[PDB]
Write a protein that binds this ligand. Structure first.
Ligand code: HEM
Ligand code: HEM
Ligand code: HEM
Ligand code: HEM
Lengths: 146, 139, 137, 146
């Protein structure tokens, strides 16, 4: 994948304004709420019995921050995403057996969370660049299946 | 299968959508065409430059069909029955595209009504959009 | 589901009805071998070849399908209890219903290939997608 | 992807018995009949207006033989699938814009056609190896999207 000058500027520029802890918690909670079968991977986190319980669950919020933080490791060097995510690919494919369609669903949820956070600053062009980024990260995460 | 809470959540947020059909529909299509460029292949007859009159007119019709499905949320297949024939039989829209349009619509709703698009409302709106997609692909 | 579709599904299932345990057991064995991650939903099963739990469970899966066939006009109503089990209790990822349906169609093609015409295949795919949608609700 | 000696044996052994022309024609016909939106990519082939017309369509039959023949080029060199299909990837991705979900659907259909053609000789272990093969070819066909 090639990154244009504009795409890199749209991604790094928005990233500096992201509230990693808040957006990360929101994205992970929406995944568990919008796509509830994903809750099967997170029984260790405890009470996921309602949207309220999920949104207020400390382990969910803690985990969302870690997930968005790794997205930031993609933002930092966009041309090395494959290697950056290789160990996480082993975890999700060889160990957890998460179907990669779920990587796409978390990426789409994150775009909606970013839209909610940035309102009209999340231009069509910015959405297009961030959708590209989440698709490239999901591809890198699925690498160990192939 | 839309629950009773689902229908309540969908009609609730659709009260803010009504009256902005043209603006929200035009923005949903512009987002789809730039985020997912291959979707433009269904519209070779369109002027697809930003702000074109065909996009604004078409966007208005798309959101108007959604509002009509919301007002008849108990029987979506019947409300959108002739649209199914157009998309599945005449247009042959690949089913993956209805997810792309639905994604773009939720993005527009989040941009303009983030407080109304709570996780629960997002979940219900996702089921509604997937049901509409099922109808429009059912040939 | 069209009327031709309903008749097409009823048609092959007269060949299926006699062999619910046999075809159900083979459908599951193919799923576990072709898509090994599907075994994580059955940690309580003996999953060795020919085990009694697979044969027992395979008979129930196909018997549920036969009931959906015998009540094809309201399948959601005939399989209502199974939705809560699969979606709420088991949290089966919806991708797995496509894998099992694929294995079922492979079993049908192996045993009744002339009956699995392209048109019958089309109708059975629509039937299996509808069942999967009901179990994920 | 890594190929076990048994997987190699199951794949090369079944391939030698495949009726490339008949199986390929039947797989493409079923794609167009079972998943009718795929007919949009094949208007150059003329009459696709009914199952009868599709199965009797000379260009459909000829194209299917070409498609299954390329699957054979993967059988011949299982460790080089990525490079064998690189040019076909440019065609399907950059030029035709076929969504890769449809590659999966064609593969699943081919498996069902092979089961019909081989009956009980299409063992569970054979199916697992051939499912792996169509999954790897589909991954190689989608390379140019990333
Ligand atoms: C799509 C992009 C994703 C990224 C970038 C990502 C990233 C991460 C990261 C950074 C961790 C931290 C590992 C650790 O600290 O031990 C993790 C763990 C984990 N992830 Fe993901 N993830 C993604 C998607 C998913 C999805 C879709 C699922 C399930 C449906 C999932 C399930 C898990 C689980 C179960 C863990 C283990 C958590 C624990 O036991 O503490 N991940 N992931
Ligand atoms: C929620 C999903 C959708 C809704 C509610 C919807 C609604 C509509 C409506 C109301 C029309 C006008 C019908 C008429 O004037 O008789 C239309 C036409 C059309 N739709 Fe959709 N649509 C949806 C999804 C899609 C998608 C995903 C695509 C392609 C990616 C698409 C492509 C088209 C095209 C090409 C036309 C013809 C437009 C023209 O010639 O004016 N639609 N749709
Ligand atoms: C056509 C699709 C399916 C049908 C008709 C079906 C039908 C059934 C039936 C009849 C039962 C037993 C209900 C009972 O005895 O109370 C069951 C249970 C179960 N199903 Fe499914 N099922 C389908 C798909 C799946 C899939 C895709 C999975 C996972 C890959 C799955 C995993 C299970 C498990 C783990 C059980 C519990 C088994 C036990 O504890 O005895 N099912 N299903
Ligand atoms: C793994 C799956 C597939 C393989 C191995 C494959 C293979 C091939 C091959 C070998 C050609 C040769 C072109 C020629 O000989 O002239 C071709 C062309 C083509 N493919 Fe595929 N194909 C696959 C899936 C698909 C799917 C799913 C679609 C559409 C839904 C598609 C659409 C086309 C089209 C439209 C052409 C051009 C036909 C023409 O203009 O003559 N392919 N493909």
């Amino acid at each position: 994948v090639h990154w244009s000058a504009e795409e890199k500027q749209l991604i790094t520029g928005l990233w500096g304004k992201v509230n990693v802890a808040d957006c990360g918690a929101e994205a992970l909670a929406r995944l568990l709420i919008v796509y509830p079968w994903t809750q099967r991977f997170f029984a260790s986190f405890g009470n996921l019995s309602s949207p309220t319980a999920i949104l207020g669950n400390p382990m969910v919020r803690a985990h969302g921050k870690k997930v968005l933080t790794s997205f930031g490791d993609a933002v930092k060097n966009l041309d090395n995403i494959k290697n950056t995510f290789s160990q996480l690919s082993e975890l999700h494919c060889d160990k957890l057996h998460v179907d990669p369609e779920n990587f796409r669903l978390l990426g789409d949820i994150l775009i909606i969370v970013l839209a909610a956070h940035f309102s009209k600053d999340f231009t069509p062009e910015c959405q297009a660049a961030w959708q590209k980024l989440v698709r490239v990260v999901a591809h890198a995460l699925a690498r160990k299946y192939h | 299968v839309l629950s009773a809470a689902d229908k309540n959540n969908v009609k609730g947020i659709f009260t803010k959508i009504a009256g902005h059909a043209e603006e929200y529909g035009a923005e949903t299509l512009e987002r789809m065409f730039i985020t997912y460029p291959p979707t433009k292949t269904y519209f070779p007859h369109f002027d697809l430059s930003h702000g074109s009159a065909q996009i604004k007119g078409h966007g208005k019709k798309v959101v108007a069909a959604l509002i009509e499905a919301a007002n008849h949320i108990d029987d979506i297949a019947g409300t959108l029955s002739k649209l199914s024939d157009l998309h599945a039989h005449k247009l042959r829209v690949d089913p993956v595209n209805f997810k792309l349009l639905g994604q773009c619509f939720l993005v527009v709703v989040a941009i303009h009504h983030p407080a109304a698009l709570t996780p629960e409302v997002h979940a219900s709106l996702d089921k509604f959009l997937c049901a509409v997609g099922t109808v429009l692909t059912a040939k």
